[PDB]
Amino acid sequence: KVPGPITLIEPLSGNTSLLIKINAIHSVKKSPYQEIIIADTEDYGRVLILDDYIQSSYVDEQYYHESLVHPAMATHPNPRDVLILGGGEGATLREALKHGTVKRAVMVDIDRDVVELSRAYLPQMHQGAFDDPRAKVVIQDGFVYVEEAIKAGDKYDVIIMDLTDPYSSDIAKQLYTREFFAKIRRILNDDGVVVTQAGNSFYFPAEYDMVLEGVKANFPIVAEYEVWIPSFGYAVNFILGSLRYDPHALTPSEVDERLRARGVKTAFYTGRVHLALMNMPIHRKLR
Template sequence: MLGVTIIQGIGRSSSMIMKIKELHVVHKSKFQEIIIAEIEEFGLSLILDGYIQSTQADEFIYHESLVHPSMVLHPNPMKVLIIGGGEGAALREVLKHNTVNNAVMVDIDEDVVELSKKYLYPIHQGSFFDKRAKIVIEDGKKFIEEAESGSFDVIILDLTDPYSSDIAKQLYTTDFYRKIYSVLTDDGVMVTQAGSSFFYRDVYMDVYQAVKSVFNYVLEYQVWIPSFGYSCNFILGSKKYNPMMLKPEDIDTILKNRNVTTKFFNGYKYLSFIYGGIY
């Protein structure tokens, strides 16, 4: 594989070139191109339509940042829904919380899920096979539209970027967030990844305004993801709980009481999310 590279899209006219050490899978599903490869400096990686989704070297930064702020904000998250997240890493983080007795992961692309099960164990770490987990192969938008009101305490949207595909765009609209709101319990919390506010400021602001128009409390934060080549943005929406009221020591206590171990996320990291600013 000497000399083979992958071009990772960053912005509208910016890219990052990475050297591939070993290519495991190149597959075209009904929805997207799927590549699983060993990338120099980043290790085992999942790439969808030219966008890196997870690498073994730094996926924990992304997935811990996506999952745990919403999970610790809710005092007792028992029923959790993940839309997307086909490699199983968001599911892995959700299942760390001992309050969870039902975690549903919905992904539109069965091929991503099955290939991840086979090739990406170091990333999903067996989360697909946890007795509390249920994997549903379905369009996330359709699943939400048909779900009963008040079904979930926390909803996590682990999607491809809002500007990466037509499929993704549908899951970043005001109408979709209104439906998310109705599917949540009365004190429910949701979070979505929202791409890059630096390279796609206009798209990001549309997503932010859509969440803000629906939820009582909104927290926007960003985290540098080396393999993405940019700071990834996240937007949290809460019906009842103000994310600004959580103190670092409260978060650390919650994580300890729930037996959650992390490599990146903790109380003081959350504080940096709140006061770190957005480009």
């Protein structure tokens, strides 16, 4: 068996791509910002594709979304106010809302078409999160939202950046700079945490290192971790910046008690997974 007859050619590095059997195409939209496809794949189930890159799949998105959200949320001892930049399919919001401490969660995506198509075609991703009375969905460039938040003196406990990739995405490029992370720091409480996905350190080390150095220039505690996402073809790199709380100091017991006390149910993330993420070095080309 080989992939086809109808296949997605998913870019990866420029020198490697994935060839993925497609069973159906549900939606194609050229938005003002990007090319959107919602399709069914044989190996990964339903997917969101943006500019040819799978952003999430039914079969493995929970690895991505739980790994993006819960280490930072569990590290903060009382996350009440949460900001999400990107996260158009709603799954980042879904995970953050599981924390019973959360009173307000704002999600800011530039592209109304991604959110509306996700609402319509990706119900296993959002799972109603867009309609939670604690949630607000804002259609705006996150750069502009953060500048307005600074003017307003707005502050959050946890900021989650769930954007398109730093190595491919023009629309997200301004949000991966040292200057942006300095703005993020200005809309965090003094014990705040930021987490971002940072592409991949194996295939895109220069872009990874640029995001890492921009977090380190602004946050005194930084954790790097990665999780293999089969549908993407690589282990996504995450970078967690913290003003006060050290994620490396949580024990599997402290994590599992915060999860239980806050009513958080997961498919992947646990205190032992947290320990593994805090101890596994990230991949690099070794020769």
